[PDB]
Amino acid sequence: PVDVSVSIFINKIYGVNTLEQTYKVDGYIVAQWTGKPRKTPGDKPLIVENTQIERWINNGLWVPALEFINVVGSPDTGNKRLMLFPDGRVIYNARFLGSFSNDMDFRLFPFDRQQFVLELEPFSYNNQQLRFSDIQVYTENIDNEEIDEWWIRKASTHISDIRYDHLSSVQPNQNEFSRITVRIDAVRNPSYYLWSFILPLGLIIAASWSVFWLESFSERLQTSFTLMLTVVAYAAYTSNILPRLPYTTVIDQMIIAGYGSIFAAILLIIFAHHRQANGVEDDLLIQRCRLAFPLGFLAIGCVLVI
Amino acid sequence: PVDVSVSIFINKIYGVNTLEQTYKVDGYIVAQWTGKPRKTPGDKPLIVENTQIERWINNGLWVPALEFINVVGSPDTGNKRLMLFPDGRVIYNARFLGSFSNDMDFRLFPFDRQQFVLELEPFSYNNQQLRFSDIQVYTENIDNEEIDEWWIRKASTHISDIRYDHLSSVQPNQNEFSRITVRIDAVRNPSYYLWSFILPLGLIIAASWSVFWLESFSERLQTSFTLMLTVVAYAAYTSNILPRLPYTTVIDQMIIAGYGSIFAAILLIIFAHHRQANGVEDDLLIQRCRLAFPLGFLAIGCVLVI
Amino acid sequence: PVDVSVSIFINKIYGVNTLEQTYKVDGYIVAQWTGKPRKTPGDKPLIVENTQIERWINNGLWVPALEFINVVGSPDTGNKRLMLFPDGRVIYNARFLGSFSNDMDFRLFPFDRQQFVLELEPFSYNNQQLRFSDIQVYTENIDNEEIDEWWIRKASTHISDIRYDHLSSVQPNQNEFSRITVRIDAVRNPSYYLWSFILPLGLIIAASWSVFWLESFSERLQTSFTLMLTVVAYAAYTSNILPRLPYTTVIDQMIIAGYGSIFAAILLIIFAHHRQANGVEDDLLIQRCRLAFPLGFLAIGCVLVI
Amino acid sequence: PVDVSVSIFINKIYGVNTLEQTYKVDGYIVAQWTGKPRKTPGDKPLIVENTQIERWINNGLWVPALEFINVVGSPDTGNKRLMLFPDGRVIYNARFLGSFSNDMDFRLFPFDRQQFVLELEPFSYNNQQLRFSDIQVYTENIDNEEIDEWWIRKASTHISDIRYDHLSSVQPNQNEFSRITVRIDAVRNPSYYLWSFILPLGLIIAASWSVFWLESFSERLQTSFTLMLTVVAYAAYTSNILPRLPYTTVIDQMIIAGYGSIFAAILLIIFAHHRQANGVEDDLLIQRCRLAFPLGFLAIGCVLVI
Amino acid sequence: PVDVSVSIFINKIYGVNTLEQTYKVDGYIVAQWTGKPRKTPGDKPLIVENTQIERWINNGLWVPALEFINVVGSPDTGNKRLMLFPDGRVIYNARFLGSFSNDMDFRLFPFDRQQFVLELEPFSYNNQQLRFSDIQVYTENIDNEEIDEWWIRKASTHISDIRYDHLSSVQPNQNEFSRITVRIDAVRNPSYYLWSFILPLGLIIAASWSVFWLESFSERLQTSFTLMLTVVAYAAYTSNILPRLPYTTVIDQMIIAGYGSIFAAILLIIFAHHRQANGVEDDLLIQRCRLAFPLGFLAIGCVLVI
């Protein structure tokens, strides 16, 4: 059972694709294992670069294919490098850029709690064990977090053994491969969305209610039709700029709320008026519920967060 | 007639392209067949990885080219692997990611009933039979379906023989290739569209009718012009965010309905008024059809679903 | 002069790019010609697949490069295959996906009459004649045309000889290559555009005129400003969803019409009023031209289609 | 100093990228030079196609690398072809598709005067002279110009010598490479923009002024607020469909003009009214400047074109 | 310690991707170092072009892999070229196009101060020193800056030594690689954004205030609802055309300001009216604060720039 030591260097995690639950990772992979001692020119280790590596394979030099279990597509491999030591051991170092997959929940969108994952595992080797895994998130935590879209925490390794129940016609015990699993926790940067979506959406819902401080009945009603048109004009601006998803986010709900608030008002206003015993006996208290549901909406809103 | 045993491992079905009727599939293919026993170093099976396989072909080792009948483009092949057994048999294993085609009907868009298909078939072999086909949809049915865009059911195999009537100048019987056909049934997740499109669209159509609870004639009419402008502002928001298609979906019809409801009203309102024997004799009952077509629209709507 | 027999199998014609006059074609190409008889292992034809073909070339086996005259870019080649017969003849079969060009006129957009073309021609061979060309449009005419964007008719071949006047320093007669030209005629599916663009645009133009059935002068005018705003809100929805072009379509003109109809009304309304001999002597007949240009617009519209 | 004769065949110039000042060019390149006579099989010229050319290089056959100085990226090379003559001379022919750069000024957008350029130049050869350059714009001038976005004129060659002041540690005179420069002049097709942007934008500015033919003061003012909202609704439609740039076009200015015209009116209207010696003494002439700046706007507009 | 002399020729810096903090760079790289003198055919330097270089490597000729530390992906390499001198020294010249990364702050968007950076560094060599670095920004400073999106200043080099604390199991001192760092300072072109966003946004905020010069109370309020709808209609036009970011820009704030100004007015107007001791005693001074916050907004605005 060959012992391999992997070292992943994360350089940048970007381009999150909300719909496909994808994110790009740029970094380097380093694998080290020991082989039958070799005669290296001079004596100091031999450095084999790109094109050359493929040659050394054709001459027996074995090199284990380490797959990225959770990769969408196939990584963009940069510079490959083989460092051959005289005492046997071999060190493989290559830079990569790939798109990884993982279960991502964007229900609370504006305030996300996501976690980026890598999953290494020998493509075709039952007894080729992954010794120790080390990840260098040499990125800067409290650096300039208000410049980048996501804020992080700290790395997280975890080696394990995966058992497949439908392999080759093998029975003895060939069905356990060692898988390195890296995890990075990150939180989304609320800022932008608060000051450009939540806030103004609120001022719209607020000024929405000021339709009650209108005297006439026609004014009270005809104005909420211009108010309806405003929430639609907003849902457009919101949608054209927000990430498409299969489910509704928080913001998606604030928009529904704005739709109900205005439909509620429409009902009250066309109720207050025709709920009479004459013709214009608008219930002085209902027509003056200018403070009834404006705060009664912070009660329906503080129950959806409970 | 060589016997081949295929095994498809579906890992993720994503990126559905409504307009081109495309969808992406990530997984592995495993093909097994038996050949003339061989002398493998040691004795335990020989493992040939990437670069190497192409070499073994140049030395006679045959490997059937298995085409993906319904693939748009050419699959993104990851790690290839040849496992050569001493008793002959050969096992080919490779990871792939490709875009597949299939007839997709999106008439009832918000509520779709689609089915993802794969179609394997030897690219150039008449008598090379596909033995047994197995698919491991090791994805989780009732897991977190309210996180993913589509909900599934269960795999579905089916081997068969395809007959081409215009092949080489061959007559005997060379015109029957065996094709593996995999089918996966899936249903779209209505949620999002209901709570962010259907609902608010209804509140717009509802409050649309409240144009009748207006006293004056000018108010009753001039307001439906702001109401018209509202449905348009909605069709914009809807279109910019929904999947472009060559035909109309359900939502596309609700939008037409909102257009007709407002045009109907426009006709009634400019009828009730000028349908007099004086000048302002607005038919007290028609001007008060505030409950005539609001429910008479649930009759025109429940006949389109019949 | 080598005789070559081509057979094109169109599998799907999609992704029309209005602006670049591009369209994608997926299918297979089959070329057959006869060479100096060969000794094939066994005796039955020899099958050379992908990688291998490039090898047989290096050993003399000649294979003519057949260019796709009208291809934007370079086709996405799938599986290549050489079938070598003992009696000489060679059969080349490969699957392709490319983007083709052609002059496309989208003037009557909603109702297009386009034609998809392919153009094969030996890249570097003067006397290498293309024998017979056959195209298998094994797609289904009256199948589910109301599911696909385009409706077709039937294939259409045509071999010819092209003469270039500026080739190599050759004089004898080297300047005539044989070009296969395939043509497929198609018509666009009006549906969607009628029920989602033409119709509602008409209800807007119709209800546009009902600005005359208003009593006051201020109402008659101030209302047409909200009517103007409506046609603009529509041109936005239309444009964001329709295909960008360098010229105006039919729909683009109906939009101009709605702009003139409203500007015409603006003139009449601000004429009828101030065309007096007092101050409010609104020409009873002009102010009541509620049926003058509404049908007088079907006369200006039925002359643009003449 | 090797004499090379180049021949560029422009097939289609499309996809202009306003922001990056890019445009795509499809065509063929033909380079001819004479070498040490060779023994060609048979005697008639030898035809070397794709894969093969790379082989002949490995056997000494030299082939000058001709770079495309102004190419963004790297051309999409199609079919390559080497025609080797017995008398020495070699003819290189290959089809290409690349993205080229050039300084493009879109200040007068609707009416552009641009020029597409190509720039060939030996990548690594001081004394390898480019003999004669010929371009076949075998496209059709007055053909169907009202179908294509751009209208042309006629080709334009020009060979020259470029001097680099910072090359290798060479002094003698190695610093002059011959560069072929092709230029094609083209004009944009105004049509669409006039009938779908300029015209309707004018009818909006025109009907804008008719806010003066209103009696009351409140009507005269409150209506220009719906007029303001209209120009904005237009800038949206315009922007979403027009090409993003770093500077303002003509249309971009007409939109500013419409903004000023309405702000001007806002000032006059709120001046005429409060510029009294009572309360409602609206200067009969100013309130009746219904023809003052409507034509006084054709004076401010005919000075921006002077 | 091999001495290498690099020379970077920047040809064009374009395609800034605000969200990913990326920018494209086209140019050539030139690396020179001296090796063991060689016998070159003739005597004058040997020119090795593309395909060939890979060959000379297989025959020992070493070529250091120089990585682009801050590259997203992997550069698009054009023509490679090896110039081998008899006296040893080797000169590597290749054209590239890659996407580079760097921290970019777009807080003051309309007026940006950004800096484009390149970072070279030997991929696998501890003692391979980079001698002198030279960059030829042979672009034209005060040329046509009002045609390009960005304005520059002047190049800026800087060689240094980077120390990695987690390399191979090496202790002596193998952990210091030499890195070339190029920096180019650039400023964004405000123009467009001023005349198409800032200006018209101001005329909207300006004319926003003229809601005070309205007599009635209903007019003063109902008009600000059409004014609100106007700022939203603007945020839409702005957003669809501006670069998506995770934070708010200057323009994003002017939009918030217009939202507050109108919400402020809404409060005042619904205060002035109901802040009585009767019913319509609108505080003659407050209702006439037509000059209170219009200039009192230039005070809140000149404190956000302080």
Side-chain angles (χ1 to χ4, degrees), chain B residues 250-262:
Chain B
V250 206
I251 291 185
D252 287 302
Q253 309 174 64
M254 299 191 138
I255 297 295
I256 321 301
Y259 272 146
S261 172
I262 285 186

Side-chain angles (χ1 to χ4, degrees), chain A residues 222-264:
Chain A
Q222 287 185 54
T223 292
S224 63
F225 275 45
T226 290
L227 221 55
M228 187 63 119
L229 189 279
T230 279
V231 171
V232 166
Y234 195 78
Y237 156 90
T238 286
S239 296
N240 176 278
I241 297 302
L242 250 48
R244 288 67 174 182
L245 304 183
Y247 44 109
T248 51
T249 78
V250 203
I251 288 186
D252 287 302
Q253 309 175 64
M254 298 191 138
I255 295 295
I256 319 302
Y259 273 146
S261 172
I262 287 185
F263 191 65

Side-chain angles (χ1 to χ4, degrees), chain A residues 152-224:
Chain A
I152 326 76
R153 296 293 179 171
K154 185 71 248 71
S156 173
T157 318
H158 169 49
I159 318 300
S160 59
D161 276 53
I162 285 61
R163 177 185 302 95
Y164 302 92
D165 313 310
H166 337 261
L167 322 98
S168 308
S169 299
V170 68
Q171 41 121 303
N173 206 56
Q174 289 57 285
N175 59 172
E176 278 177 50
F177 307 69
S178 57
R179 171 184 304 189
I180 298 174
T181 306
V182 183
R183 290 195 171 76
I184 303 180
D185 281 300
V187 168
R188 183 187 292 290
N189 183 178
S191 61
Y192 184 75
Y193 305 97
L194 290 165
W195 296 64
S196 291
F197 290 78
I198 324 295
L199 196 187
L201 181 276
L203 303 189
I204 298 297
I205 306 308
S208 166
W209 308 313
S210 66
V211 75
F212 285 0
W213 296 51
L214 278 175
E215 310 311 323
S216 173
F217 157 69
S218 298
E219 309 178 305
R220 271 146 76 255
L221 177 157
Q222 287 185 54
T223 292
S224 63

Side-chain angles (χ1 to χ4, degrees), chain D residues 96-112:
Chain D
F96 73 87
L97 167 53
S99 290
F100 299 66
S101 185
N102 187 330
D103 286 303
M104 296 175 98
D105 182 307
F106 305 92
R107 295 165 178 297
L108 354 174
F109 176 60
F111 326 93
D112 275 320

